[PDB]
């Protein structure tokens, strides 16, 4: 069923984050893993899979550790040919050339589209729709992560969603609607002067998927 919408004072306030917002920003500013039709080559711990994926652009990784919520998810995708799409990290990437991410995995077979599919993001500032823009995927089932990355990546460029020290926006959540059912993620870091990249991205480790045909995306921001 539907996840309920944010209650009063449920959302992280960016004014209560006193650290460097840079460390959030760099997760959505040109920082992503992407690969087509690959199969795991190894495994470190029981809830992860390792893929041979080369950073052709910047050469920052040859292997990617994809971390799941549980063993079942890893077992499921172990020997499957998959597509990978997600926001990765290096700082405190535990992997005994390398990088870490969570989820972002979909079966390749039976999930490709003849042509790219568009999903319109409706962006609200203090309730008002001032901006709309499409994200595209080639997948019938696509991870919320992939969509989330694409949305925030856009918004980091244009609207400066995140900056080195702090955001123009006090609160922000991204909402995914499929028919009646919906869910959302808080786009702002927990309060304090310590931002843990790995901890934040761990929300993607459920590998949550949506139908790219039915899903609508709404971004609700508030100003200062």
């Amino acid at each position: 069923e539907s996840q309920p919408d944010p209650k009063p004072d449920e959302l992280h306030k960016s004014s209560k984050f006193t650290g460097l917002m840079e460390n959030m920003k760099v997760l959505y500013d040109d920082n992503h893993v992407s690969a087509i039709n690959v199969k795991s080559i190894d495994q470190f711990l029981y809830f992860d899979l390792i893929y041979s994926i080369k950073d052709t652009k910047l050469g920052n990784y040859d292997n990617v550790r994809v971390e799941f919520k549980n063993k079942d998810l890893a077992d499921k995708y172990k020997d499957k040919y998959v597509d990978v799409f997600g926001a990765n990290y290096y700082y405190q990437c535990y992997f005994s050339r390398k990088t870490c991410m969570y989820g972002g995995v979909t079966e390749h077979n039976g999930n490709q589209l003849d042509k790219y599919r568009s999903i319109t993001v409706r962006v609200f500032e203090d309730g008002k729709n001032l901006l709309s823009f499409d994200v595209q995927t080639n997948k019938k089932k696509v991870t919320a992560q992939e969509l989330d990355y694409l949305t925030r990546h856009y918004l980091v460029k244009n609207k400066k969603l995140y900056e080195f020290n702090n955001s123009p926006y006090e609160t922000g959540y991204i909402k995914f609607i499929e028919n009646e059912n919906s869910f959302w993620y808080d786009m702002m870091p927990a309060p304090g002067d310590k931002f843990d990249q790995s901890k934040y991205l761990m929300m993607y480790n459920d590998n949550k998927m949506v139908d790219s045909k039915d899903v609508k995306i709404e971004v609700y921001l508030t100003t200062k």
Partner: nanobody
Amino acid sequence: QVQLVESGGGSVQAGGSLRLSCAASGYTYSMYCMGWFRQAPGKEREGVAGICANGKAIHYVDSVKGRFTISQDNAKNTVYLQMNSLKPEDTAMYYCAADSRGGIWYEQQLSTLRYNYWGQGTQVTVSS
């Protein structure tokens, strides 16, 4: 392929000054981090100064605070190290390093881990 070529190393005397320079080339994209490391014979390689995110994040090792200044010209794609009040302790091979990975890695920001690209270095000498 990335290339870092350091220069400006020399043989000075206690209380002297040197300005290191590094010419970066071969990528055509924007580098996130650029830094200066040093290593003497015997001792492990140590990070000295760093400058990240269009100069928004500058860090120094304690032993060079107030004496060394890292700086950047984006127009030239050069990084500099103004080395004032030099001491025998500062004698070493100085290396420029670079990195395209983002973030300010608390306490690991001047470690060798933070950087993937490296020059061949320039010798610095300081005589009592």
